[PDB]
Symmetry: D2
Subunit: 384 residues, 4 copies
Amino acid sequence: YQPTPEDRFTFGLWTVGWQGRDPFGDATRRALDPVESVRRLAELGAHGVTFHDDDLIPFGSSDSEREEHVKRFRQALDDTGMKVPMATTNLFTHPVFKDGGFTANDRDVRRYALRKTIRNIDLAVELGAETYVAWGGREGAESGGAKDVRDALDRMKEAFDLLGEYVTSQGYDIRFAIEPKPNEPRGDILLPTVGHALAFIERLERPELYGVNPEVGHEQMAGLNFPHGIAQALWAGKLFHIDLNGQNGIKYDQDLRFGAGDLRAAFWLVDLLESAGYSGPRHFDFKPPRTEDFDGVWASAAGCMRNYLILKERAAAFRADPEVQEALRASRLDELARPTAADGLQALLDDRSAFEEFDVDAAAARGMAFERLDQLAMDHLLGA
Amino acid sequence: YQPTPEDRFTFGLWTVGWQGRDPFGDATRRALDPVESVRRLAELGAHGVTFHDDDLIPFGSSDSEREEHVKRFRQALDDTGMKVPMATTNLFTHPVFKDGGFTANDRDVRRYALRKTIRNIDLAVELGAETYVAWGGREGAESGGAKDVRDALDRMKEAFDLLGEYVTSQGYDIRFAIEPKPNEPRGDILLPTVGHALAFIERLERPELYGVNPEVGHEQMAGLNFPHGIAQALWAGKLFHIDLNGQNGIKYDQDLRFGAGDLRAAFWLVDLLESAGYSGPRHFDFKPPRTEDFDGVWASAAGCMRNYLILKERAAAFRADPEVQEALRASRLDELARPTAADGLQALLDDRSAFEEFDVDAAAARGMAFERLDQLAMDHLLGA
Amino acid sequence: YQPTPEDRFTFGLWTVGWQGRDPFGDATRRALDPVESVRRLAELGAHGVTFHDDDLIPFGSSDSEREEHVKRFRQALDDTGMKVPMATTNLFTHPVFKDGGFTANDRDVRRYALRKTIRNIDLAVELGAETYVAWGGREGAESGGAKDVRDALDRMKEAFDLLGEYVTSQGYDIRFAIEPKPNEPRGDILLPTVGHALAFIERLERPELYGVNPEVGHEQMAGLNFPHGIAQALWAGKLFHIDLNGQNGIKYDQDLRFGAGDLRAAFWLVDLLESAGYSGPRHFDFKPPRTEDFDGVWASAAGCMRNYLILKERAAAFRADPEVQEALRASRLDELARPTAADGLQALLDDRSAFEEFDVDAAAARGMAFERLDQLAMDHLLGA
Amino acid sequence: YQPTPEDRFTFGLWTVGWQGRDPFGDATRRALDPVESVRRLAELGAHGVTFHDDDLIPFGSSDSEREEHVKRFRQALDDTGMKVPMATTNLFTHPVFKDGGFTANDRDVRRYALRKTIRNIDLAVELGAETYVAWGGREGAESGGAKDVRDALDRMKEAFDLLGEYVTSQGYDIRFAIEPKPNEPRGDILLPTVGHALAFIERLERPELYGVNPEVGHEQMAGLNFPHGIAQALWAGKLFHIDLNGQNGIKYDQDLRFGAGDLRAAFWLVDLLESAGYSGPRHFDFKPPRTEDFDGVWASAAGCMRNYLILKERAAAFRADPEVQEALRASRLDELARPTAADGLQALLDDRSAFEEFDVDAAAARGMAFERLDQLAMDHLLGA
Ligand SMILES: [Mg+2]
Ligand SMILES: [Mg+2]
Ligand SMILES: [Mg+2]
Ligand SMILES: [Mg+2]
Ligand SMILES: [Mg+2]
Ligand SMILES: [Mg+2]
Ligand SMILES: [Mg+2]
Ligand SMILES: [Mg+2]
């Protein structure tokens, strides 16, 4: 299970670089130089890295220091072969963003968030990023009267339309991916799930420029089925990008390494991505626990890729098993793929076997044989 | 706080008629005649009632018994003035629906579910229903291999498109409202939240025929903010109908009476509905607890309407308070309503006060004054 | 992975016998004769079965029919070699128990619940049961004013003390195990977790007669760590019995087969039970999904035992691995087992290396190496 | 609703002093001088304040600076009349505590945590604290193999027994209160709920020295009923202290001001505390949201006390209402207070009206009238 750069594993600089500061604790690790992270991840078999603007260029850098950080970073990419498929904006750390960026109540803050983003898109294009991710981590509210959500949605649509106007203006070959999260650090966050983001995209001026970037642990913080959410995103044609990690149920955002958390969900996830032919990056947005030193940081990042590779092998064996293939026919997964009424509405209305002559009790008596199928999936996951 | 039929309070027959059977217990109350429920609700000040097909016509009724139940029901509506604004299909009780209706793996079951629905739409139109609700309570899965969600979404789209073809075919003035629920009785249910339903509607052939019917307790079973969800539905123009009840957090579907459960959320809900000018029915989908006898049934249903009326008074006082109106300006809710960049993209890029000359520290230092605003909302809710 | 009756797998009659009635659906399967369940489970490799009183003797049976059901049941046990290690009372199905049994507000109901229980203890002893389980499924409330919890706890203590007086009176060699559940079918249930039950036992007159019977899915309905709960029960000496199943997070009680649900938690559970030397029954309290016919019922029950056996093999390999044994020393699990201050309070106060001369920064810099250890546990679970 | 110091409202220095640093954001407010907080809280009507050791004496202070901070603090208490009823130890911020304090795997860290605590008890006694709170925020694990929970419980018992030996040794009139929390910042925390803490106390050498300090939002992070938990703590005699705040369901620890969050639960809480005659401090452990400036800080702290006072008035009116008093008799709350079988076991066994002659159907037919009672509680909460 050794990663190849064909496996397209990518990491956020903020992931292996997380210093371990949490709500009740100070940093446990020194800061990482972006250059060293690129080198270490390259040796581990990663394909690329991603960044917030403020991960790369310390907030408040003059043009001189900005260009110096960029050229050092770019040198590290040349020396390792690492790519930068995705970039994003930090619109949540600085106190100015305490009521949001695109949907702050203060108009001048909203303008500034648009400008800060625009400046990083230019940089993202220069480094070759294909996807620009937007996570509105501060767009929301702790109390009900603080945010008119219809107005806030007007301002959110407005920001994304202006960004699409810009990329169109500049001839940029780059697409946007909205990343949902239901809560934290705001008490409730706007566009809380994959569904809410998908719905919203359909109201934008140029919907084809916009997809979603779902995260395992985020949909799981609302107790939702992450493979189900991904399947609805693929069915709609909007899965531009994906963030992999683990999460143990409904609680604070854990950002465990991938495959930790809900293991059977990771299995069904990999199975879906592999079978659907998803070809984008396998991006890990995770936090090595603050118990770890740097050796634990790199072990945890290695574990992300290893667990994807093991599950991929297990899902491929599960779908290849002839006994599984017969189990699927036994549960009528083949019939689910067939049109309900390709013959049409009128034929349906005149088909007496569809109602008048339908033997409802015989139909109800057929078992679905789902428990045998699931044990085979278990047997395959465990290698039994 | 006495209900007027202008208040448009409506009840499901299955609500006050719930016999008290639960996963671990037998019925505590005898069955109610639909006629008696119409009479009792009319005396309480209700505007109308709603029904599943099987609430009204016992499953498996000949045409003779069917027409007899309908004419008795219709007589009760004539005698009381009660209306029937909404109707829906039972596609979840009978064992034949154990793997779903529109998305059962078995094709013959899917055909039968379409036919059973079509027969009830005709009836719904005859009784004057304006909205037809679809709750796919059995569309889902307990295990991962049992349902290909992309295929299932193909079958769901197919069913809803055929239904829209039918109403179009017949010149029916009726619209569909999809009711989301994240789980129970399936381990996970397809279209689990308002967002997932909104997204899906945009893929249908005739999206303008389809809206959502959100339920308080359903979005709250995923820990989501129900007023936030409703606001996104209004912003999209899709709030055709709404189901009111209470729920205490993430657990089984409680169906408590309205205003029980999360009280502050009910307040912010009423405030939104009243201020947005929502004009549809205020529908209660609730279950009088099985501890109650029939006198408790009617007290609980009365409590539904009373609590809506109290909160409506409190929200109206909150928005009318000049001190609240000044608090809202202090938190810049007025600025949230103003366009971020009505001047346009190019003006934004050349506006040096939006980035180069923006005093980020001064902006960050302004408090939002949200806690004063929320205490005024509290003071108003409590009548202090 | 074939079960031996030394593996002590036991099943509730109500488990494989569940007819599939749920809050929104009718039965999908016919009723099972207790005799046939004993035969079928014996062929599958089960060691024994358990029962509620009403599983075995239909509610309201004359003494004549009661003794006839008992003798038929007893004949089935003689013919198969099956044992009955545990029995319990149904104090939740009948409408009379709608406000609870031991803590009903009505005094006459509380008396009747005590008598119904006492009658089943006599029967349990005759059939050789060693543990009598109490699940107060209806002890609780949907609203706050309905139950004074201090009074209710007085009545609960009173019931359990009287039951202990009885078994003492009769010279019965049998112990009680309290089964916690946080909710459903009551909105909140009294003694909601393992901790609440453990605390309560310490207030009973004869605490040594009383332990806990935790259930996987129950502690998981509050989002708690089930292995952590079991370890606190073992540490206190109170793990008399245990109920195994699966559950996918915080939602209605799923009763999935064991190993479904949170798989990594099942692994850590088995590891704890095997290493601690737990010698009681491995009892499955589960529900074959109502999608299944009887062949699926027996496949699901087989899956319960298979998954226990696979995990047991994997946990045994994990603890036997020398590389794991060195990883555990690297994370200082050996030091956690050593007394903090066997030298005593005064030595601690005068030990300058414990405060005055303690190098806090050197200590903080040691990584815990937990992520390497967890990946080895993963590698072992998956058989990589 | 103006607070009197007889109302015994107390605040943690870390509460109004929280700078607004969260997992994804930097501080929004400057640090507060403990002296200014004492002055500002005194003007607001607070009775006292509480502290961690590191709130008062910056970590790593020489004896000279330590005594200087203490004397400045003590001067502020003399000038305002403020008391210090409770103190506690910071065993979670410093990186050395990243695997816990009392249950760190490293033995030298455990010794150091005991010594750091002991030093603050001496200080707590000098300032007149009556309760010493222990919150084991870092005692736990993110992965299963990292902590043997039985060993960890041995080390936890050991630490608390040594602390009790110390206070006994020194003749100190002070008692310990254990504060449970189910998660965050560890993935799971040991002693996760009130029940788990109560159970554990019963294993300590001197249980009478130890009670619990429950927090609203903590029990609510496991979806549990906080008034139910408090009632079990009062029934056991262990409610030494209490922490008040608000929390919106199962998610990260919000620390909203009291009365925000689950409002009806705050009502039932106040009702319980007032009726049970709880005489300890009403302590607010809350965080003014980081959206606020200092004026919002003080408004939020004022809101804590106001909302307690409003609810207290409403609960007192609810219990004083003759119509409520008759409703309680109608739901048989009076019978719940009466012994089930004061007549004894043998009388119970020979009482034919308790089983043989019991009319089970008549009993089951009595409604509980809980919904009328709850609407009166609602009517009273809202002032209708
Ligand atoms: Mg995250
Ligand atoms: Mg992310
Ligand atoms: Mg419902
Ligand atoms: Mg509904
Ligand atoms: Mg269960
Ligand atoms: Mg059980
Ligand atoms: Mg807290
Ligand atoms: Mg606290």
